[PDB]
Amino acid sequence: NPAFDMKQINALNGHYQTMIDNGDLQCASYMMSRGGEVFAAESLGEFTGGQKEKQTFQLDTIREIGALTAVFTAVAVMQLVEKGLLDLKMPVKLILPAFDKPGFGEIKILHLLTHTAGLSFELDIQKAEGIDLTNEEEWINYLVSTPLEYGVDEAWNYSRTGFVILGIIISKVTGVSYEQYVTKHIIEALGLERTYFYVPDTLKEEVCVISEHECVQLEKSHHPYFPNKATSGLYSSLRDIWKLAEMFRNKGRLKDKKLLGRKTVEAMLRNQIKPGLPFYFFGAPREEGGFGLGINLWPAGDHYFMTEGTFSHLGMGWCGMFSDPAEDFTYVFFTPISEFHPHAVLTPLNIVWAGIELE
Numbered sequence: 001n002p003a004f005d006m007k008q009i010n011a012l013n014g015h016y017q018t019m020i021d022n023g024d025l026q027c028a029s030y031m032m033s034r035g036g037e038v039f040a041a042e043s044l045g046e047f048t049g050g051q052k053e054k055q056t057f058q059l060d061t062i063r064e065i066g067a068l069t070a071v072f073t074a075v076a077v078m079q080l081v082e083k084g085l086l087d088l089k090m091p092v093k094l095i096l097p098a099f100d101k102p103g104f105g106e107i108k109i110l111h112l113l114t115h116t117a118g119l120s121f122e123l124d125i126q127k128a129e130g131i132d133l134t135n136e137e138e139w140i141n142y143l144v145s146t147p148l149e150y151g152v153d154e155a156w157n158y159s160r161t162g163f164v165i166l167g168i169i170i171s172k173v174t175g176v177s178y179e180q181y182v183t184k185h186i187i188e189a190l191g192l193e194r195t196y197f198y199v200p201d202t203l204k205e206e207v208c209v210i211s212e213h214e215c216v217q218l219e220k221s222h223h224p225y226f227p228n229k230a231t232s233g234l235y236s237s238l239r240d241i242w243k244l245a246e247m248f249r250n251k252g253r254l255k256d257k258k259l260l261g262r263k264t265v266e267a268m269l270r271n272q273i274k275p276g277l278p279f280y281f282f283g284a285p286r287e288e289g290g291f292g293l294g295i296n297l298w299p300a301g302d303h304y305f306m307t308e309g310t311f312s313h314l315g316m317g318w319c320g321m322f323s324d325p326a327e328d329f330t331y332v333f334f335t336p337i338s339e340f341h342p343h344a345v346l347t348p349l350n351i352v353w354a355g356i357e358l359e
Protein backbone atom coordinates (compact mmCIF):
# COMPACT_ATOMS: atom_id res chain seq x y z
CA ASN A 1 0.00 0.00 0.00
CA PRO A 2 2.63 2.65 0.91
CA ALA A 3 5.28 1.24 -1.49
CA PHE A 4 8.18 1.70 0.92
CA ASP A 5 11.19 -0.50 1.67
CA MET A 6 10.94 -1.19 5.41
CA LYS A 7 14.67 -1.99 5.48
CA GLN A 8 15.23 1.77 5.29
CA ILE A 9 13.01 2.17 8.36
CA ASN A 10 15.41 -0.10 10.26
CA ALA A 11 18.33 1.88 8.82
CA LEU A 12 16.67 5.15 9.82
CA ASN A 13 16.00 3.90 13.36
CA GLY A 14 19.54 2.58 13.70
CA HIS A 15 20.86 5.92 12.45
CA TYR A 16 19.03 7.83 15.19
CA GLN A 17 19.69 5.22 17.88
CA THR A 18 23.43 5.19 17.14
CA MET A 19 23.70 8.94 17.72
CA ILE A 20 21.61 8.55 20.88
CA ASP A 21 23.85 5.78 22.21
CA ASN A 22 26.93 7.87 21.35
CA GLY A 23 25.74 10.98 23.21
CA ASP A 24 25.47 13.04 20.00
CA LEU A 25 21.67 13.09 20.35
CA GLN A 26 19.20 12.97 23.23
CA CYS A 27 16.02 12.02 21.36
CA ALA A 28 14.51 11.78 17.89
CA SER A 29 11.08 11.26 16.35
CA TYR A 30 9.71 11.17 12.81
CA MET A 31 6.54 10.56 10.82
CA MET A 32 6.23 9.65 7.14
CA SER A 33 3.17 9.18 4.94
CA ARG A 34 2.27 8.07 1.41
CA GLY A 35 -0.91 9.46 -0.11
CA GLY A 36 -1.86 11.06 3.20
CA GLU A 37 -1.65 7.77 5.15
CA VAL A 38 0.99 7.58 7.88
CA PHE A 39 2.66 4.17 7.60
CA ALA A 40 5.74 4.68 9.80
CA ALA A 41 6.18 6.73 12.97
CA GLU A 42 8.65 6.32 15.83
CA SER A 43 10.14 8.24 18.75
CA LEU A 44 13.55 7.35 20.18
CA GLY A 45 15.37 8.16 23.40
CA GLU A 46 14.60 10.47 26.30
CA PHE A 47 15.24 14.08 27.28
CA THR A 48 16.40 15.76 30.49
CA GLY A 49 13.73 18.37 31.05
CA GLY A 50 12.61 16.84 34.31
CA GLN A 51 16.23 16.56 35.53
CA LYS A 52 16.64 12.97 36.80
CA GLU A 53 14.16 10.27 35.78
CA LYS A 54 14.58 11.15 32.13
CA GLN A 55 11.29 11.85 30.38
CA THR A 56 10.45 9.48 27.54
CA PHE A 57 10.27 11.14 24.13
CA GLN A 58 6.87 10.32 22.62
CA LEU A 59 5.11 11.00 19.33
CA ASP A 60 2.73 13.55 20.89
CA THR A 61 5.50 15.36 22.77
CA ILE A 62 5.30 19.16 22.42
CA ARG A 63 8.38 21.12 21.34
CA GLU A 64 9.24 24.47 19.78
CA ILE A 65 9.38 24.42 15.98
CA GLY A 66 11.62 27.46 15.55
CA ALA A 67 11.54 28.94 12.06
CA LEU A 68 8.70 26.59 11.09
CA THR A 69 6.57 29.32 12.70
CA ALA A 70 7.39 31.44 9.64
CA VAL A 71 5.48 28.90 7.54
CA PHE A 72 2.39 29.71 9.61
CA THR A 73 3.14 33.39 8.96
CA ALA A 74 3.38 32.80 5.20
CA VAL A 75 -0.04 31.11 5.20
CA ALA A 76 -1.58 34.04 7.07
CA VAL A 77 -0.14 36.58 4.61
CA MET A 78 -1.45 34.62 1.62
CA GLN A 79 -4.84 34.29 3.32
CA LEU A 80 -5.04 38.09 3.45
CA VAL A 81 -4.14 38.24 -0.25
CA GLU A 82 -7.03 35.85 -0.94
CA LYS A 83 -9.38 38.22 0.91
CA GLY A 84 -8.09 41.29 -0.94
CA LEU A 85 -6.66 42.91 2.20
CA LEU A 86 -3.03 42.60 1.03
CA ASP A 87 -1.08 42.52 -2.22
CA LEU A 88 2.46 41.19 -2.45
CA LYS A 89 3.48 44.22 -4.55
CA MET A 90 2.44 46.62 -1.78
CA PRO A 91 5.43 48.65 -0.53
CA VAL A 92 6.00 48.14 3.19
CA LYS A 93 6.20 51.92 3.70
CA LEU A 94 2.49 52.20 2.85
CA ILE A 95 1.77 50.18 6.02
CA LEU A 96 4.80 51.08 8.18
CA PRO A 97 5.60 54.79 7.69
CA ALA A 98 9.05 54.22 9.22
CA PHE A 99 10.02 52.41 5.99
CA ASP A 100 9.54 55.67 4.03
CA LYS A 101 13.28 56.23 3.68
CA PRO A 102 16.03 55.29 1.20
CA GLY A 103 16.55 51.56 0.79
CA PHE A 104 13.60 50.56 2.95
CA GLY A 105 11.19 52.47 0.70
CA GLU A 106 11.70 49.84 -2.02
CA ILE A 107 10.87 46.83 0.18
CA LYS A 108 7.59 45.22 -0.87
CA ILE A 109 5.71 42.44 0.90
CA LEU A 110 6.87 40.03 -1.82
CA HIS A 111 10.50 40.70 -0.85
CA LEU A 112 9.83 39.75 2.78
CA LEU A 113 8.09 36.51 1.78
CA THR A 114 11.06 35.47 -0.39
CA HIS A 115 13.95 36.79 1.77
CA THR A 116 14.97 39.20 -1.02
CA ALA A 117 14.40 42.45 0.90
CA GLY A 118 18.14 42.74 1.61
CA LEU A 119 17.63 42.39 5.37
CA SER A 120 20.31 40.76 7.48
CA PHE A 121 19.67 37.51 9.35
CA GLU A 122 19.03 39.26 12.67
CA LEU A 123 19.25 42.55 14.56
CA ASP A 124 21.88 43.55 17.12
CA ILE A 125 20.07 43.08 20.43
CA GLN A 126 22.89 44.20 22.75
CA LYS A 127 23.27 47.44 20.75
CA ALA A 128 19.67 48.61 21.33
CA GLU A 129 19.96 49.67 24.97
CA GLY A 130 17.23 52.03 26.12
CA ILE A 131 14.57 50.92 23.63
CA ASP A 132 11.60 48.57 24.04
CA LEU A 133 12.06 45.75 21.52
CA THR A 134 8.63 44.43 22.54
CA ASN A 135 6.95 47.60 21.27
CA GLU A 136 6.21 47.46 17.54
CA GLU A 137 7.00 51.09 16.70
CA GLU A 138 10.27 51.26 18.64
CA TRP A 139 11.40 47.92 17.20
CA ILE A 140 10.81 49.10 13.62
CA ASN A 141 12.55 52.44 14.19
CA TYR A 142 15.64 50.62 15.47
CA LEU A 143 15.37 48.25 12.49
CA VAL A 144 15.41 51.06 9.93
CA SER A 145 18.21 52.58 12.01
CA THR A 146 20.20 49.47 10.89
CA PRO A 147 21.87 49.47 7.47
CA LEU A 148 20.33 47.21 4.86
CA GLU A 149 22.70 44.38 3.97
CA TYR A 150 21.83 44.10 0.26
CA GLY A 151 19.61 45.95 -2.15
CA VAL A 152 16.12 44.70 -2.85
CA ASP A 153 15.96 41.76 -5.29
CA GLU A 154 19.78 41.60 -5.23
CA ALA A 155 20.40 38.49 -3.09
CA TRP A 156 18.59 35.73 -1.22
CA ASN A 157 19.41 36.00 2.49
CA TYR A 158 17.29 34.27 5.13
CA SER A 159 16.08 36.90 7.60
CA ARG A 160 14.24 36.25 10.84
CA THR A 161 13.35 39.95 11.08
CA GLY A 162 11.71 39.90 7.66
CA PHE A 163 8.88 37.68 8.90
CA VAL A 164 8.52 39.60 12.16
CA ILE A 165 7.71 42.55 9.88
CA LEU A 166 5.12 40.39 8.11
CA GLY A 167 3.56 39.57 11.47
CA ILE A 168 3.35 43.28 12.23
CA ILE A 169 1.76 43.86 8.81
CA ILE A 170 -0.76 41.09 9.54
CA SER A 171 -1.65 42.85 12.78
CA LYS A 172 -2.00 46.33 11.28
CA VAL A 173 -4.32 45.32 8.41
CA THR A 174 -6.52 42.78 10.23
CA GLY A 175 -6.92 44.87 13.39
CA VAL A 176 -6.16 41.85 15.60
CA SER A 177 -2.87 40.66 17.02
CA TYR A 178 -0.74 38.32 14.92
CA GLU A 179 -1.05 35.49 17.45
CA GLN A 180 -4.83 36.00 17.54
CA TYR A 181 -5.11 35.68 13.76
CA VAL A 182 -2.91 32.59 13.39
CA THR A 183 -4.72 30.82 16.24
CA LYS A 184 -8.19 31.35 14.76
CA HIS A 185 -7.52 31.14 11.01
CA ILE A 186 -4.74 28.52 10.89
CA ILE A 187 -4.25 26.59 14.14
CA GLU A 188 -7.94 26.07 14.89
CA ALA A 189 -9.01 26.12 11.23
CA LEU A 190 -6.65 23.25 10.35
CA GLY A 191 -7.62 21.34 13.49
CA LEU A 192 -4.21 21.35 15.16
CA GLU A 193 -4.59 19.54 18.48
CA ARG A 194 -1.28 20.32 20.25
CA THR A 195 -0.05 23.57 18.68
CA TYR A 196 0.19 26.67 20.87
CA PHE A 197 1.92 30.01 20.98
CA TYR A 198 1.88 29.50 24.76
CA VAL A 199 1.48 26.03 26.26
CA PRO A 200 -1.23 25.72 28.93
CA ASP A 201 0.09 24.79 32.36
CA THR A 202 -1.70 21.42 32.23
CA LEU A 203 0.49 20.41 29.26
CA LYS A 204 3.85 21.96 30.18
CA GLU A 205 5.20 18.70 31.63
CA GLU A 206 4.62 17.11 28.20
CA VAL A 207 6.95 19.62 26.50
CA CYS A 208 10.39 18.32 25.55
CA VAL A 209 13.14 20.59 26.88
CA ILE A 210 16.85 19.78 26.68
CA SER A 211 18.28 22.99 28.19
CA GLU A 212 16.96 25.02 31.11
CA HIS A 213 17.18 28.01 28.77
CA GLU A 214 14.17 26.38 27.10
CA CYS A 215 12.62 25.47 30.46
CA VAL A 216 12.42 29.14 31.44
CA GLN A 217 11.24 30.20 27.96
CA LEU A 218 8.26 27.84 28.30
CA GLU A 219 6.73 30.00 31.06
CA LYS A 220 6.92 33.32 29.17
CA SER A 221 3.85 34.99 27.67
CA HIS A 222 5.72 37.02 25.02
CA HIS A 223 8.81 36.71 22.83
CA PRO A 224 11.91 38.03 24.64
CA TYR A 225 13.48 40.08 21.82
CA PHE A 226 10.79 40.28 19.12
CA PRO A 227 7.54 42.30 19.16
CA ASN A 228 5.68 39.17 17.99
CA LYS A 229 6.15 35.43 17.51
CA ALA A 230 5.90 35.55 13.71
CA THR A 231 9.29 34.02 12.84
CA SER A 232 9.67 31.73 15.89
CA GLY A 233 7.83 30.97 19.10
CA LEU A 234 5.29 28.27 18.25
CA TYR A 235 5.04 24.99 20.13
CA SER A 236 3.72 22.02 18.16
CA SER A 237 4.06 18.27 17.58
CA LEU A 238 4.80 15.86 14.74
CA ARG A 239 1.13 15.19 13.96
CA ASP A 240 0.38 18.91 13.65
CA ILE A 241 3.46 19.69 11.55
CA TRP A 242 2.54 16.69 9.40
CA LYS A 243 -0.97 18.10 8.98
CA LEU A 244 0.48 21.46 7.93
CA ALA A 245 2.78 19.84 5.36
CA GLU A 246 -0.07 17.71 3.99
CA MET A 247 -2.18 20.86 3.61
CA PHE A 248 0.38 22.25 1.16
CA ARG A 249 0.73 18.93 -0.69
CA ASN A 250 -3.05 18.77 -1.16
CA LYS A 251 -2.95 22.42 -2.35
CA GLY A 252 -4.59 24.24 0.53
CA ARG A 253 -7.06 21.76 2.03
CA LEU A 254 -6.91 18.83 4.46
CA LYS A 255 -10.02 16.63 4.28
CA ASP A 256 -12.83 19.10 5.02
CA LYS A 257 -10.62 21.93 6.33
CA LYS A 258 -9.55 24.40 3.63
CA LEU A 259 -6.87 26.96 4.48
CA LEU A 260 -5.95 28.23 1.00
CA GLY A 261 -7.12 27.98 -2.57
CA ARG A 262 -5.28 25.51 -4.77
CA LYS A 263 -4.16 28.31 -7.09
CA THR A 264 -2.71 30.19 -4.11
CA VAL A 265 -0.66 27.18 -2.99
CA GLU A 266 0.66 26.66 -6.52
CA ALA A 267 2.03 30.21 -6.49
CA MET A 268 3.54 29.59 -3.04
CA LEU A 269 5.19 26.38 -4.26
CA ARG A 270 6.72 27.72 -7.49
CA ASN A 271 10.13 29.36 -7.51
CA GLN A 272 10.01 33.11 -6.86
CA ILE A 273 13.74 33.95 -6.94
CA LYS A 274 15.16 35.59 -10.05
CA PRO A 275 17.85 33.46 -11.72
CA GLY A 276 21.51 34.21 -11.09
CA LEU A 277 21.00 35.81 -7.68
CA PRO A 278 23.53 34.83 -4.99
CA PHE A 279 22.28 32.94 -1.94
CA TYR A 280 23.50 33.62 1.60
CA PHE A 281 22.60 31.89 4.87
CA PHE A 282 23.86 32.94 8.32
CA GLY A 283 26.77 34.98 6.99
CA ALA A 284 27.93 32.23 4.61
CA PRO A 285 27.15 31.64 0.93
CA ARG A 286 24.57 28.95 0.23
CA GLU A 287 23.92 26.87 -2.87
CA GLU A 288 21.30 28.39 -5.14
CA GLY A 289 17.87 26.78 -5.05
CA GLY A 290 14.20 27.46 -5.51
CA PHE A 291 12.31 29.42 -2.88
CA GLY A 292 8.57 30.10 -3.02
CA LEU A 293 6.26 32.38 -1.06
CA GLY A 294 7.58 31.66 2.42
CA ILE A 295 8.22 28.00 1.53
CA ASN A 296 11.63 26.54 0.72
CA LEU A 297 12.07 24.49 -2.47
CA TRP A 298 15.62 23.41 -1.55
CA PRO A 299 17.28 20.99 -1.03
CA ALA A 300 15.77 19.06 -3.95
CA GLY A 301 17.00 17.61 -7.21
CA ASP A 302 20.74 17.82 -7.92
CA HIS A 303 22.49 14.99 -6.00
CA TYR A 304 19.67 14.81 -3.45
CA PHE A 305 17.16 11.97 -3.58
CA MET A 306 14.21 14.32 -3.03
CA THR A 307 12.39 14.93 -6.32
CA GLU A 308 12.57 18.32 -7.97
CA GLY A 309 9.59 20.23 -6.60
CA THR A 310 9.96 18.99 -3.01
CA PHE A 311 9.01 21.87 -0.72
CA SER A 312 10.30 22.11 2.82
CA HIS A 313 11.40 24.29 5.72
CA LEU A 314 13.73 23.79 8.67
CA GLY A 315 13.50 25.07 12.22
CA MET A 316 16.05 25.45 15.00
CA GLY A 317 15.50 22.79 17.63
CA TRP A 318 15.94 21.06 15.38
CA CYS A 319 12.93 20.06 13.29
CA GLY A 320 11.81 19.97 9.68
CA MET A 321 9.05 19.11 7.25
CA PHE A 322 9.63 17.70 3.76
CA SER A 323 6.90 16.82 1.27
CA ASP A 324 7.39 15.32 -2.21
CA PRO A 325 4.35 15.99 -4.44
CA ALA A 326 5.68 13.69 -7.17
CA GLU A 327 5.64 10.76 -4.70
CA ASP A 328 2.69 11.88 -2.53
CA PHE A 329 5.30 11.56 0.22
CA THR A 330 5.68 13.64 3.39
CA TYR A 331 8.32 13.38 6.11
CA VAL A 332 8.47 15.38 9.35
CA PHE A 333 10.94 14.93 12.19
CA PHE A 334 11.95 16.19 15.63
CA THR A 335 15.69 16.08 16.39
CA PRO A 336 16.18 18.05 19.62
CA ILE A 337 19.78 19.25 19.64
CA SER A 338 21.60 22.40 20.74
CA GLU A 339 23.95 22.56 17.73
CA PHE A 340 23.26 22.00 14.06
CA HIS A 341 24.77 18.72 12.87
CA PRO A 342 23.92 17.71 9.27
CA HIS A 343 24.30 14.03 10.17
CA ALA A 344 21.23 14.39 12.43
CA VAL A 345 19.15 16.90 10.43
CA LEU A 346 19.92 16.38 6.72
CA THR A 347 21.47 12.90 6.42
CA PRO A 348 18.25 11.02 7.40
CA LEU A 349 16.65 12.57 4.30
CA ASN A 350 18.90 10.34 2.20
CA ILE A 351 17.85 7.29 4.23
CA VAL A 352 14.14 8.11 4.02
CA TRP A 353 13.92 8.88 0.29
CA ALA A 354 16.03 5.81 -0.54
CA GLY A 355 13.15 3.66 0.71
CA ILE A 356 10.48 5.09 -1.59
CA GLU A 357 9.33 2.53 -4.16
CA LEU A 358 6.99 2.70 -7.14
CA GLU A 359 3.55 3.90 -6.01
Ligand SMILES: C[C@@H]1CCC/C=C/C=C\[C@H](O)C[C@@H](O)C/C=C\C=C\[C@@H](O)C/C=C/C=C\C(=O)O1
Pocket: 066, 067, 068, 158, 281, 282, 286, 296, 298, 299, 313, 314, 315, 316, 339, 340
Ligand atom coordinates in the same frame (compact mmCIF):
# COMPACT_ATOMS: atom_id res chain seq x y z
C1 LIG B 1 18.67 24.39 4.02
C2 LIG B 1 18.91 25.64 4.87
C3 LIG B 1 19.68 25.26 6.14
C4 LIG B 1 20.83 24.28 5.91
C5 LIG B 1 21.58 24.01 7.21
C6 LIG B 1 22.64 25.09 7.42
C7 LIG B 1 22.95 25.57 8.61
C8 LIG B 1 24.03 26.66 8.65
C9 LIG B 1 24.58 27.23 9.71
C10 LIG B 1 24.26 26.97 11.19
O1 LIG B 1 23.85 25.65 11.42
C11 LIG B 1 23.21 27.95 11.69
C12 LIG B 1 22.40 27.41 12.87
O2 LIG B 1 23.26 27.06 13.92
C13 LIG B 1 21.40 28.46 13.37
C14 LIG B 1 21.25 29.61 12.38
C15 LIG B 1 20.16 29.69 11.65
C16 LIG B 1 19.09 28.62 11.80
C17 LIG B 1 17.96 28.70 11.13
C18 LIG B 1 16.91 27.60 11.31
O3 LIG B 1 15.69 28.17 11.66
C19 LIG B 1 16.75 26.83 10.00
C20 LIG B 1 16.20 27.75 8.91
C21 LIG B 1 16.50 27.51 7.64
C22 LIG B 1 15.94 28.42 6.55
C23 LIG B 1 16.36 28.40 5.30
C24 LIG B 1 17.47 27.50 4.75
O4 LIG B 1 18.16 27.91 3.88
O5 LIG B 1 17.68 26.20 5.24
